[PDB]
Design a protein around this nucleic acid. Structure first.
Ligand code: MG
Ligand code: MG
Ligand code: MG
Ligand code: MG
Ligand code: MG
Ligand code: MG
Ligand code: MG
Ligand code: MG
Ligand code: MG
Ligand code: MG
Ligand code: MG
Ligand code: MG
Ligand code: MG
Ligand code: MG
Ligand code: MG
Ligand code: MG
Ligand code: MG
Ligand code: MG
Ligand code: MG
Ligand code: MG
Ligand code: MG
Ligand code: MG
Ligand code: MG
Ligand code: MG
Ligand code: MG
Ligand code: MG
Ligand code: MG
Ligand code: MG
Ligand code: MG
Ligand code: MG
Ligand code: ZN
Lengths: 159, 104, 213, 75
RNA sequence: GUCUACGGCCAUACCACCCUGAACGCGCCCGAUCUCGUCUGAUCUCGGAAGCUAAGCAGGGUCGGGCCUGGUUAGUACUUGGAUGGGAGACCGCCUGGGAAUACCGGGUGCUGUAGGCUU
RNA sequence: ACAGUGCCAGGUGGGGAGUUUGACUGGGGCGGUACACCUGUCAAACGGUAACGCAGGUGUCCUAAGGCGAGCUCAGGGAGGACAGAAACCUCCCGUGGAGCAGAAGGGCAAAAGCUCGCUUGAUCUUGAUUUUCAGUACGAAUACAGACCGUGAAAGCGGGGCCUCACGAUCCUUCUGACCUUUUGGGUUUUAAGCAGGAGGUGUCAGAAAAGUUACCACAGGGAUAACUGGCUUGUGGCGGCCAAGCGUUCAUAGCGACGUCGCUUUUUGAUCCUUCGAUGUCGGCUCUUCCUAUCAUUGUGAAGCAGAAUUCACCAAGCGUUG
RNA sequence: ACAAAGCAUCGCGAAGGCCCGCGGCGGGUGUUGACGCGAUGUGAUUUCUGCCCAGUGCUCUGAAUGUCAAAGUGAAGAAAUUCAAUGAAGCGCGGGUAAACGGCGGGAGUAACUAUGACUCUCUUAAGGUAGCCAAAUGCCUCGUCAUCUAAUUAGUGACGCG
RNA sequence: GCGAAAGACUAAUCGAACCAUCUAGUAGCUGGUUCCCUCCGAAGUUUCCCUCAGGAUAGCUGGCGCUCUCGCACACGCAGUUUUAUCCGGUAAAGCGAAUGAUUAGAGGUCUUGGGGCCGAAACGAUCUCAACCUAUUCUCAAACUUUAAAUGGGUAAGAAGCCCGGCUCGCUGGCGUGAGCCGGGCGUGGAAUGGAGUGCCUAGUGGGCCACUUUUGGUAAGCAGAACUGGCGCUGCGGGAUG
RNA sequence: GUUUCCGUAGUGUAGUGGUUAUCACGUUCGCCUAACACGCGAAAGGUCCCCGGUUCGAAACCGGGCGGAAACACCA
């Protein structure tokens, strides 16, 4: 049997990456979070107060609370089946803004724009994304060379 | 461990930090007339043998030490409990431990 | 003494290197990984003969022992005591274990069977991959056949199979042998006893000023 | 009388037979867990929305008649 | 072109040495009356403005070490799936897809934010 | 006036009574504790995962070894400097951490979390919310807040024990503390007792029985879920046999041998294992009797010899018939 | 194997020893009296019966300043009560007892072949196994060593004894 | 009870008689458990237990429903998918001329220094030598090492509960504003493919498992012991593998 | 193989809690003696088994090893 300890096996997880042991860069606690914002937890060794727990390391969740230097945040945690939407309290040093959201809200700001315009025209524009289509028959042109002849090369034991 | 004989901390009644007089706690003499004893008396009474369990399996070698604080200002004198983590050695007012000296 | 090499032939368990975590290891049997004239120069021994493994297996410390000696003996011979250099390129590094021989006296009364099956260190063993070299010899280009036969005899002290191969390098370096003389004059390479130092167009200019001076 | 000591063998089957359910989320989730000084204030904000409903109602008809004028000026 | 004050990202900014710095500043620098601190006005605190770029700092320089990025190593090592494939076995080949790391070669060497100067 | 009987009290009491005499466990017993916890690993790059799998640690210690605040810089090395040497003390230079941070390791740490000082009690009082084991129950431990009282610092802040991951304990009972608390019963006053709210006294089998043996005089319910025979799988060990060949053999590797190594066979050794049998397969030898194998001791036929003869080893076809008192 | 004669301890002068019974001023030994009764141990005869009272027992006109209850007495209180002084037997302390249970050791040097060691050093304990006896029904190593008995003996007998 | 003692004997019975009753004593343990057809259909895992042949609770199962959806030319929702973005990761591999830990060789070094020497009274004098260090090198390694660093894989996100305006409320927050909360208007298919979804009650059986690909821990190995991932067998016949 | 116990002067043995090392004998030197004994005075002698760690400091406290010893290996 193994030990239930809160920081078991994190020997390699919470470890500051490389050539970064030291002062936390001050930007990381001067960006703002407000309820609704989506956040990806990523623990960190230097700050021990308010750490998450290793099963949330790498997970995302939205924000529901904001205290003086921590953020209440709801993530999903799968347990033997049933997924429990549970809310944890994590100090800011272990948190980033997830740009996972931000591809859309840029497809949105552009979709809303491309619909307000081209509405004075009435021309229906492709608003939906659409997966990578078949590559659309074209030409190839060799100019004045035949292709280069390739031959499988004779084996020889290198060692 | 070692603790000082006095300390300033919250006195529940005054609503303020106030000087206290620290002393460690010893149990009281058991009543002989508390309900539990009176009951245990006249069930462990008669031709029955022993009735309630009794310990013969002791495990730990120390008890949590309990400080019995009391308000120094008069008219309050409201004693209060304070438990501390265990220790098999304990004193009061013992010798502030003298950094940077010769260990003879 | 020791179980036959059968039982410790395959690489089953993760490497068990001698460290603070296993101790009391009996010192490896093979000790001297190179003999002959290890005081040679690169400029006088152009024949990199190899003995390359063809199977992913283990080699006992005591095997690398006999394989070296029996090659020292078909060498200094036809070659002479000065005319070669022999390298063993597998240091027995991984510690092999033995459950304690299930020792019993008389018929028996008890052994516990498997409780605490974990056993003691018994010896050491080399890990070998396909296409990885075991032994390498270097002599004069004159003496090719005697490298082939000296390595051919050492095959018979080894389990599994291994091909004998003559390298395109110069002696023990990493440099293709058709190119050595060219990279020696103009000093892309500088003699360094056995090996050779590849000097690039990188460093301070005064480091050059020594050469071509 | 030794026995097996553990396994997660067909457990994936079991808890995926009723198809692991991401927790059904409604709008308006509970405020339980938010710091009291937020609520202890936002309840006073909510409790006195009505004091100031006259401003809200007349100022609503102002924009409702200014945008009934904006949609009629377009007409 | 550049500095000073406060900075962001934290080596393309470091380190080693080499060369050059107009004017503003930054500094070295000159004192211990008061404030303050020491075994020592060495540091810190304070009052200064006689000197000098000697150094820090700035700016460059090195077939410089380091870092930052590309190439190669290499479709190599490894691997998701697949077969009534091979092999006594170790292992190995192919099909369907993904795809690294050194040594070895190149290129680069701090970008900027706000507020104030100087080159009027 | 005690002997003695009547009744209470202390002692003594396997003479007698009742009962108990843990669990895990490559059968059990004896050995351990994998029985509550904590590191690194195993663990297959989310988490989670087993064995009496490894390598280890805990039942602590701290009045500061905590809380702020300053102030510096550590291990190690070089060069110097009266006694002074590999080591005392002083001084300069280098010093990304190679020291230190009470302990196991693992993470984390530099005008710090390290060391040195001054001031201290946030190790205090009080509701809830959440994390960790998880049933998503407790206990423990922890994380964010909010409300008081403070400590500290110019201040921003920081601080409700110990830089982070372990250092702990229900019901019942007992004790202590708190409220001009409630009940103490037909009213009223005092004791006394019972409540309410927090601490302590403890269960180490650590979600918590008050507990020694023996049975070869033994009993019952069962168990092939669990041994002692056979049989299987395996083959370490045992036996038998090859390959390479350094050497022995006066000389000569291989007539006969053969080290250092290496590949196998075999189930006439012992082990491992626990698949079969516990509504029982009679569990050592010897006697008798049959048959079979060849890994040939003799005899038929042969090839080898360091075979002159004799004698003798080595090998081949060979199990026909022998192998005793 | 038991018994046994014999040897030996042990209690007891009768309101006694041992013992039965549910109870009586009840019964057994007892129609008894220490040459008797009860309780054990060994086992004829012969020859002997060695050390140890530290342990556990038993026991002793033995000190009970150790403790120790019921009552009893003393004190405070309004009373339940609370607190005092005191103190029986046994426990603690001190004698005796092994024909009570039982116990009875380990190291070095040293003699003129070698070896062995009379002899001499420490250490320990409650004494450290004496007279005898032994590979015995008691010896692991073990088919101990020598002899004898056999053609041949893990058997037998006899000696040897750090057992 | 009785025993010249074996636990002997006490009416075929003795380590404790026979008879009736208390008595249908208790059993986590063996054995059995009675008609058909139809539909659905498991577990051998979780935590706690004087728990390990048993229970408790989790799951997995069935029954009963309900709430709606609309194939009634006029659908939202979900998913053991995949794309498109986007974070997370320390295994295979690699490396050790990058740290830590091992380790071979030479060249280079009186680095330091030594311990022996040989030539020296002695001498960093000469020549060696071996030790330890280190300057460029080189051979080989690490499960409890790591600069690097995959494959498979884990999170989210891909809109109406969404955007965009207007305005009120505050005991929080502040030079003003923040922020949150409200009211009021203004605007629709936001990647592929699939399928009606949501939710509440009771609840049996089970809690000995076994095998195979790949991964992998003890062991020499096992039809051995122990994990992962999926698949099976148990619960299941049929064609094939002679037989299974 | 598992569980214990030790190692200290030439020898057998004390000893502490982490600041020190004993006793006895042996031995060396004197003195008595005609000469040995005996006796009296003085003397010298150990990394406290080898190790690594903790610590200001280890002979003594931990961990490993080496050597000498003791105790278990039962039911078939
Ligand atoms: Mg009574
Ligand atoms: Mg000055
Ligand atoms: Mg300058
Ligand atoms: Mg200058
Ligand atoms: Mg460069
Ligand atoms: Mg009894
Ligand atoms: Mg058991
Ligand atoms: Mg995984
Ligand atoms: Mg500070
Ligand atoms: Mg507060
Ligand atoms: Mg601290
Ligand atoms: Mg009354
Ligand atoms: Mg018997
Ligand atoms: Mg008997
Ligand atoms: Mg079985
Ligand atoms: Mg068998
Ligand atoms: Mg010869
Ligand atoms: Mg099994
Ligand atoms: Mg039968
Ligand atoms: Mg034959
Ligand atoms: Mg007797
Ligand atoms: Mg006697
Ligand atoms: Mg006595
Ligand atoms: Mg005798
Ligand atoms: Mg006799
Ligand atoms: Mg006979
Ligand atoms: Mg005899
Ligand atoms: Mg059953
Ligand atoms: Mg890992
Ligand atoms: Mg069952
Ligand atoms: Zn008070």
């Amino acid at each position: 049997t193994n030990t239930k300890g809160k920081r078991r096996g994190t020997r390699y997880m919470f470890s500051r990456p490389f050539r970064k042991h030291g002062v936390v860069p001050l930007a990381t606690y001067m960006r703002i979070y407000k309820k609704g914002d989506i956040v990806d937890i990523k623990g960190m060794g230097t700050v021990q107060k308010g750490m998450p727990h290793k099963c949330y390391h790498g997970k995302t969740g939205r924000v529901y609370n904001v205290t003086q230097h921590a953020v209440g945040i709801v993530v999903n945690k799968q347990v033997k089946g049933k997924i429990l939407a549970k809310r944890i309290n994590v100090r800011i040093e272990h948190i980033k803004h997830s740009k996972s959201r931000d591809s859309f809200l840029k497809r949105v700001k552009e979709n809303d724009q491309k619909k307000k315009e081209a509405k004075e025209k009435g021309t229906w524009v492709q608003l939906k994304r659409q997966p990578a289509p078949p590559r659309e028959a074209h030409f190839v042109r060799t100019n004045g060379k035949e292709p280069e002849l390739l031959e499988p090369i004779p084996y020889e034991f290198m060692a | 461990v070692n603790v000082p004989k006095t300390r300033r901390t919250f006195c529940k009644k005054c609503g303020k930090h106030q000087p206290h007089k620290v002393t460690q706690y010893k149990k009281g003499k058991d009543s002989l007339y508390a309900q539990g004893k009176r009951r245990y008396d006249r069930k462990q009474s008669g031709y029955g043998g022993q009735t309630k369990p009794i310990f013969r399996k002791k495990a730990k070698t120390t008890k949590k030490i309990v400080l019995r604080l009391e308000c120094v200002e008069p008219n309050c004198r409201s004693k209060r409990m304070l438990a501390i983590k265990r220790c098999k050695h304990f004193e009061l007012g013992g010798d502030k431990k003298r950094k940077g000296q010769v260990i003879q | 003494g020791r179980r036959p090499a059968r039982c410790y032939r395959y690489c089953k368990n993760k490497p068990y290197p001698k460290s603070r975590f296993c101790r009391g290891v009996p010192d490896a049997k093979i000790r001297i990984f190179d003999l002959g004239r290890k005081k040679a120069k690169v400029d006088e021994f152009p024949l990199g003969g190899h003995m390359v493994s063809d199977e992913y297996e283990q080699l006992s410390s005591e095997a690398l022992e006999a394989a070296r000696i029996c090659a020292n003996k078909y060498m200094v011979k036809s070659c002479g005591r000065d005319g070669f250099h022999m390298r063993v390129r597998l240091h027995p590094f991984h510690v092999i274990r033995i459950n304690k021989m299930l020792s019993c006296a008389g018929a028996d009364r008890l052994q516990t069977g498997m409780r605490g099956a974990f056993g003691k260190p018994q010896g050491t063993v080399a890990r070998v991959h396909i296409g990885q070299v075991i032994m390498s010899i270097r002599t004069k280009l004159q003496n090719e056949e005697h490298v082939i036969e000296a390595l051919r005899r050492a095959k018979f002290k080894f389990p599994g199979r291994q091909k004998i191969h003559i390298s395109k390098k110069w002696g023990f370096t990493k440099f293709n042998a058709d190119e050595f003389e060219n990279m020696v004059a103009k000093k892309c390479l500088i003699p360094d006893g056995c090996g050779v130092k590849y000097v690039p167009n990188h460093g301070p200019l005064d480091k050059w000023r020594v050469l071509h001076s | 009388a030794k026995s097996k000591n553990h396994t997660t063998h067909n457990q994936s089957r079991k808890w995926h037979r009723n198809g692991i359910k991401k927790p059904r989320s409604q709008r308006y989730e509970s405020l339980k867990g938010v710091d009291p000084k937020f609520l202890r204030n936002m309840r006073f904000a909510k409790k006195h929305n009505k004091k100031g409903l006259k401003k809200m109602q007349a100022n609503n008809a102002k924009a409702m008649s200014a945008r009934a004028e904006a949609i009629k000026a377009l007409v």
